[PDB]
Amino acid sequence: MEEYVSEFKDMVRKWVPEWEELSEQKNNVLAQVKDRAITIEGLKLLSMLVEVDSCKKHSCRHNTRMTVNAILRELKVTCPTLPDVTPDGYCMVGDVLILLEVFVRTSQEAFEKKYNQDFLKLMQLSSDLKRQNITLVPVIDGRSSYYVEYIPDWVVERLRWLLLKLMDG
Amino acid sequence: MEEYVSEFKDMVRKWVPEWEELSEQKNNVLAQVKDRAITIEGLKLLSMLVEVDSCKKHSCRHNTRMTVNAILRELKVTCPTLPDVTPDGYCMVGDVLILLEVFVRTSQEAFEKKYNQDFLKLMQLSSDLKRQNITLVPVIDGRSSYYVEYIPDWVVERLRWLLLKLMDG
Structure with a gap:
């Protein structure tokens, strides 16, 4: 059964x-x-x-349960308290921080909507990071299905x- | 009139x-x-x-008329000849190269299609760059309309x- x-x-x-x-x-x-x-x-x-x-x-790097604040403490970055954004992945190359957000949305609309919500959640951090000499490069990966390379x-x-x-x- | x-x-x-x-x-x-x-x-x-x-x-950096090969000569990067991909923007931070491609597509399908074509055009460069000690981070910016920040x-x-x-x- x-x-x-x-x-x-x-x-x-x-x-x-x-x-x-x-x-x-x-x-x-x-x-x-x-x-x-x-x-x-x-x-x-x-x-x-x-x-x-x-x-x-x-x-x-994949992230499962860290806020950006928690992440930057990991990275030895000094920063005032930012909002507790929970990015999906991240990587620090010199003064450049990449925050990666990922979603899968099949509703063309519920999707692009979701795109902005995500780009916005990230960029809001931009300027405070920059004051601390961190260039925030935000990457949003909108996907319309669940395909992956390795499967x-x-x-x-x-x-x-x-x-x-x-x-x- | x-x-x-x-x-x-x-x-x-x-x-x-x-x-x-x-x-x-x-x-x-x-x-x-x-x-x-x-x-x-x-x-x-x-x-x-x-x-x-x-x-x-x-x-x-915005790109209008350069191939990646042309770009890397600009960047003083040594590399064998890659395909003449024409990225929309790029930035080199240490050993990391970001190629940025942008499109606007309103057909939910003609869109995600276009997403992959673009992610693929880029990743194909990944491994040859890596042999030359360049980590390719590809960024595709799929947009469903033409909005911009500054307008x-x-x-x-x-x-x-x-x-x-x-x-x-």
């Missing part, structure tokens, strides 16, 4: 690399046993996969398609 | 900054006298405006709306 669930755990175990950035959320998914639960971690992962894709593409697109679509099967009810 | 043309030259003269990056194409537009002609430079400018917007936002959006829409009036025929 309902082995969309196990094929799904099976696909995950196979196709999601043993990368450190992903080990956490992968062990989440593969630990779940309840249907509802597995489906939730599933969505969390789909998103993480696309985020870690962007990170790699843009050569950015065959035919597999992504099955993976997501799998979750919808599971969601019914 | 038909002073969409002059209001248009009037708007241009007023709202397009006296920036160097834009002086060229602005003097183009304001020099035109024929209807068809003015309309062409008009489109070239609308695009340039959105490109120079992106450049500023991402703190990139009121109500004015952009009038500006473009103006061109359609002119195009009829």
